[PDB]
Design a protein around this ligand. Structure first.
Ligand SMILES: Nc1ncnc2c1ncn2[C@@H]1O[C@H](COP(=O)(O)OP(=O)(O)O)[C@@H](O)[C@H]1O
Ligand SMILES: [Mg+2]
Ligand SMILES: [Mg+2]
Lengths: 20, 337
C-alpha cells in the first residue's frame, strides 16, 4: 500500500529544509 | 470589507517594517528549562521570564552557524518580518536581542505542540479536521501576500496547535518581502513547487502549491510526492502526476488538482479572483470564513494541557550548553538585528 511504502521510508520524521 | 481590513493591516505593518523594534530583552531575564524543538539552524527552548513568571519559547541562533549556512539575509528577514506582523494565526514575537555569540527571538509559547507529531500519531486527519486548519492557512497567506510577503516553509513541523486547538504559524526563516519574482532555492523538498525546483524565478504562488501539499498530507497522512532521497522527490513533483487515497472526497481531489497545478496560469490562489477561487471552492462550502478569523469555530481537537510549562505535547531533545564567547562575533553583519 502507499501508506506501507511511506511508513517504511526514510522520511517519516521531522524534515530538514533545503537552501542547497 | 476584507479590502478595508487589509489596507489598515498594511499601514500597521509598514510602520514596524520601516522602524523595527530592537533589543527588547536580555538573556539573563530568562531561565532556560528545556528544548522544545530543533530546526536546521539553532534551537527553540522553553524558558521562564523571571520578573513575570511567564513561559516563552526562545529561538536561539548561533551567529557563526547562521553565517556558515549563508543565512544572514534570511535571518535579518526573519526577525524584521516577524516583529512587524499581526494576525490571529501567526505566532507573536515577544522579544528579540543578541549577544556576542547568538541571536534570540522570544515568542509566545504554543503548548499544543507541532501539527506534525499529532498527524503522525493519529495517522491522518478527517476532512473536516484538515479543512479547519487549512482555512487558517488560507487566511494567513491572504494576509501575508497582501503585505508582499512570501512565506516559503509551510509544513506540519512549522505549524503549532494552541490551547484553543487553533494554528499558530511559526518559523519565518525563509519569509521574504518582495514584489514579483525571487530565485532562492529554499524550503522543504516535499513542499517545493516545481518552478522553484526548476530555477525559473518564482513568486507567491509557491505558497499556494505548498498549501496543496499540506492539505494532501493532512488528509492522506503522507505527502503527495515522497521518496527516499530529495532527488527522487523532485522528479515526482516535476512530473506532476499525483494519485489520491481512495477515501478522498471528489471535492477534495478537485481542489488539490487546482492547487497542485504545475501551470501557474491555472494554479488557484494565483489567478484573477485570487484567493477567492480557494475560499469559494466546494471543499470549503461549509467553512465560515469570518467565524474562523474570529476563532468562534469549535476546534475538532484540543490538546491536553497540564499547566504553564507543560511540554508534554513535544518530543524530548538532547540538551546542549549555550555558550557566549567573551569576543563579539559578526557584529557588523547583524547590526540591524
Ligand atoms: N512559539 C513556539 N512554541 C513552542 N514551540 C516552538 C515555538 N516555535 C518553535 N517551536 C519548536 O521549535 C522548532 C523549531 O522552530 P523553528 O522556528 O521552526 O526553527 P527552524 O527555523 O530552525 O526550523 C519548531 O518546529 C517547534 O517544534
Ligand atoms: Mg522550522
Ligand atoms: Mg526554518
Amino acid at each position: 500500500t502507499t501508506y506501507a511504502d511511506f511508513i517504511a521510508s526514510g522520511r517519516t520524521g521531522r524534515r530538514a529544509c533545503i537552501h542547497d | 470589507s476584507v479590502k478595508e481590513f487589509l489596507a489598515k493591516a498594511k499601514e500597521d505593518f509598514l510602520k514596524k517594517w520601516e522602524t523595527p523594534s530592537q533589543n527588547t530583552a536580555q538573556l539573563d531575564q530568562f531561565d532556560r528549562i528545556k528544548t522544545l524543538g530543533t530546526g536546521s539552524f539553532g534551537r527553540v527552548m522553553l524558558v521562564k521570564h523571571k520578573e513575570s513568571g511567564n513561559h516563552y519559547a526562545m529561538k536561539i541562533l548561533d551567529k557563526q552557524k547562521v553565517v556558515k549556512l549563508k543565512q544572514i539575509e534570511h535571518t535579518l528577514n526573519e526577525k524584521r518580518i516577524l516583529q512587524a506582523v499581526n494576525f490571529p494565526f501567526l505566532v507573536k514575537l515577544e522579544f528579540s536581542f543578541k549577544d556576542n555569540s547568538n541571536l534570540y527571538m522570544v515568542m509566545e509559547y504554543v503548548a499544543g505542540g507541532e501539527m506534525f507529531s499529532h498527524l503522525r500519531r493519529i495517522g491522518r486527519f478527517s476532512e473536516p479536521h484538515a479543512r479547519f486548519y487549512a482555512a487558517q492557512i488560507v487566511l494567513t497567506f491572504e494576509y501575508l501576500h497582501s503585505l508582499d510577503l512570501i512565506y516559503r516553509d509551510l509544513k506540519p513541523e512549522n505549524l503549532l496547535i494552541d490551547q484553543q486547538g487553533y494554528i499558530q504559524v511559526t518559523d519565518f526563516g525563509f519569509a521574504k518581502r518582495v514584489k514579483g519574482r525571487t530565485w532562492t532555492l529554499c524550503g522543504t523538498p516535499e513542499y517545493l513547487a516545481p518552478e522553484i525546483i526548476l530555477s525559473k524565478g518564482y513568486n507567491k504562488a509557491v505558497d499556494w502549491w505548498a498549501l496543496g501539499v499540506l492539505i494532501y498530507e493532512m488528509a492522506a497522512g503522507y505527502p503527495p510526492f515522497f521518496a527516499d532521497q530529495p532527488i527522487q522527490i523532485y522528479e515526482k513533483i516535476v512530473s506532476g502526476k499525483v494519485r489520491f487515497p481512495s477515501h478522498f472526497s471528489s471535492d477534495l481531489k478537485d481542489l488539490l488538482r487546482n492547487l497542485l497545478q504545475v501551470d501557474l496560469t491555472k494554479r488557484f490562489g494565483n489567478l484573477k479572483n485570487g484567493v477567492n477561487d480557494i475560499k469559494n471552492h466546494k471543499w470549503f462550502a461549509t467553512t465560515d470564513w469570518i467565524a474562523i478569523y474570529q476563532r468562534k469555530v469549535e476546534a475538532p481537537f484540543i490538546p491536553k494541557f497540564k499547566g504553564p510549562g507543560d511540554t508534554s505535547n513535544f518530543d524530548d531533545y538532547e540538551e546542549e550548553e549555550i555558550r557566549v564567547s567573551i569576543n563579539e562575533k559578526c557584529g557588523k553583519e547583524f547590526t540591524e538585528f
